[PDB]
């Protein structure tokens, strides 16, 4: 649909990073103010995560118990928080290089874009041995996601090219999105709709999988948007750090 709201967010700075949980609570990187906020489906309260310590965060992401994951690029790591927690924790991440994007799966596995080392790594729950998935010839990997399936997605805007690679594959793929100029945000939804913010052409585009039919989402009135997250029904979310803030078009 075309049926877009403008979410009752306050004192956004540069919103970048945006992800949504199965409650349909909103989770946003106020990139410039060095913090992370929420707002629950239907609220008008937004809250800040009790995050410490963040300098530019950047991607976020939130895991089925609630857990939130912060890129925190100006210090090279990523931070978790549980739900509910004072105690922020630093992931045993090794050598990352202004990472930019954060995916977490069913599983628990958490995925980074290594953004300035043109690579994508990962951990799993409760591991130190962080892994490096073989993509081939990343330059400026951005955005990350994860599907139901455990395939990763990636916007490697370095080559102008959006990749996917199944769990257990050695082999990427490059999907044909149209048109694209260097992609930022990606998020993928329960039926592996990837949909991408063209941050070079201040839209969003969406591609169903295996297809090569692209559509652009009816926003109206976007400025430069950036993240971009999808929920359960569908409805997308998306940063927009040209105006500071963000909205929502039902599916
Ligand atoms: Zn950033
Ligand atoms: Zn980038
Ligand atoms: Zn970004
Ligand atoms: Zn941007």
Redesign the pocket.
Same mark, same amino acid.
């Given at each position: 649909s075309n049926t877009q709201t403008v979410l009752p967010f306050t004192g956004l700075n540069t919103p @970048?990073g945006v992800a949504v949980d199965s409650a349909g609570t909103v989770y946003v990187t106020d990139?410039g103010n060095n913090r992370v906020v929420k707002l629950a489906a239907g609220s008008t309260n937004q809250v800040t995560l009790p995050f410490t310590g963040l300098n530019?965060p950047?991607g976020v992401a939130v895991d089925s118990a609630g857990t939130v994951y912060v890129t925190d690029?100006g210090n090279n790591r990523v931070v978790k928080l549980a739900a509910g927690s004072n105690t922020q924790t630093v992931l045993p991440f090794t050598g990352l290089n202004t990472p @930019?994007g954060v995916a977490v799966d069913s599983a628990g596995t958490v995925y980074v874009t290594d953004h300035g080392n043109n690579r994508v790594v990962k951990l799993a729950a409760g591991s130190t041995n962080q892994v490096t998935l073989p993509f081939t010839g990343l330059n400026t990997p951005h955005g990350v996601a994860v599907d139901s399936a455990g395939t990763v997605y990636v916007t490697d805007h370095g080559n102008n090219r959006v990749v996917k690679l199944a769990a257990g594959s050695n082999t990427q793929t490059v999907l044909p999105f149209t048109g694209l100029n260097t992609p930022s945000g990606v998020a993928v939804d329960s039926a592996g709709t990837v949909y991408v913010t063209d941050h070079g052409n201040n839209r969003v585009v969406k591609l169903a999988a295996g297809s090569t039919n692209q559509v652009t989402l009816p926003f109206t009135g976007l400025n430069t948007p950036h993240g971009v997250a999808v929920d359960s029904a569908g409805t997308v979310y998306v940063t927009d750090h040209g105006n500071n803030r963000v909205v929502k078009l039902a599916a």
């Open positions: @970048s990139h530019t950047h690029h @930019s």
